[PDB]
Amino acid sequence: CRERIEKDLELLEKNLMEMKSIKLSDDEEAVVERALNYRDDSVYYLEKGDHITSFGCITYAHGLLDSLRMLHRIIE
Amino acid sequence: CRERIEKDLELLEKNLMEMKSIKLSDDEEAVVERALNYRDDSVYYLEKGDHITSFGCITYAHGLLDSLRMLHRIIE
């Protein structure tokens, strides 16, 4: 599970960088901030050895960000 | 983990019902459809006993939906 978590942590960062030129509303920025908070929580739980909670946190963060990627037609 | 998954499955359904009066764009509908697909995958993995993958699927679905809830100011 550690490898799955780490790959998802890296992917979130990459996807965030891909988006830095997109102008976001305050509410969209709040969605991004929430994703970053859950990414941080994922790292906290990973390091403590709680892989289930850690994985849930990072996949939740991906859901938040992927919605924005879809709405901005970065992905389909 | 089964209980955590099941509670999240139920919560997704409740949150979906809360949203049924909101008029969504095609792209927002695609986000909802994606969430429903990952919810279905969560059930598939749960029943097969792959709790880690199942949990990741349902929390990802929650991320997708929560972004929409935030953008529509249903949550803050």
Contact status, residue A54 vs residue A45, Cβ threshold 8 Å: yes
Stated length of chain B: 76
What does the alpha-carbon distance between residue A24 and residue A27 come to, in Å, rounded to a whole number?
8
> What are the residue ranges spanned by the domains of chain B?
1-76
Among candidates B51, B71, B7, B33, which has minimal Cα distance to A51?
B51
Among candidates B40, B43, B35, which has minimal Cα distance to B61?
B35
Q: What is the DSSP annotation of B14-66?
A: HHHHHTTTS---HHHHHHHHHHHHHHHHHHHHHHTT-HHHHHHHHHHHHHHHH
Experiment used for this model: X-ray
Q: What is the DSSP annotation of A10-41?
A: HHHHHHHHHTTTS---HHHHHHHHHHHHHHHH
Supply the CATH classification number for the domain B1-76.
Answer: 1.20.1270.90
B53 vs A2, A13, A67, B26, B57, CA distance in Å? Answer: 13, 21, 20, 28, 6
Among candidates B19, B20, B9, which has minimal Cα distance to B59?
B9
Q: What is the DSSP annotation of A49-64?
A: T-HHHHHHHHHHHHHH
What does the alpha-carbon distance between residue A36 and residue A62 come to, in Å, rounded to a whole number?
10
Which residues of chain B have a Cβ shorter than 8 Å from any chain A Cβ? 1, 4, 27-28, 30-31, 34-35, 38, 51-52, 55-57, 59-68, 70-71, 73, 76
Residue A63: closest C-alpha in chain B: B63
Q: Which residue has the tokens 């509410």?
A: A27
The answer to whether the CB atoms of B71 and A1 lie below 8 A apart is no
Count the Cβ atoms, other than its own, within 10 Å of residue B24: 14
